[PDB]
Amino acid sequence: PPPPPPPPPPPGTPSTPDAAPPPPP
Amino acid sequence: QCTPCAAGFYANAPDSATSCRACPRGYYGPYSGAYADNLGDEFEGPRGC
DSSP states (O other): OOOOOOOOOOOOOOOOOOOOOOOOO | OOOOOOTTEEESSSSSOOOEEEOOTTOOOOSSSEEOOSSSOTTOOSSOO
């Protein structure tokens, strides 16, 4: 009998985090 | 497998990094895969921030 198929690749990788003098007299 | 650190980020350890941190205020990481180095300032590396 033929051999089984290969498993599907894992999902996409996660994203990235966010950010006046006084007058004289 | 262990993924490269994203651009603008740096690995927390020179070898066997456990987390990736963003480059701080006043720094910039041009390349991806940047990593911190114990020698010198702890916030920079050969390709780090």
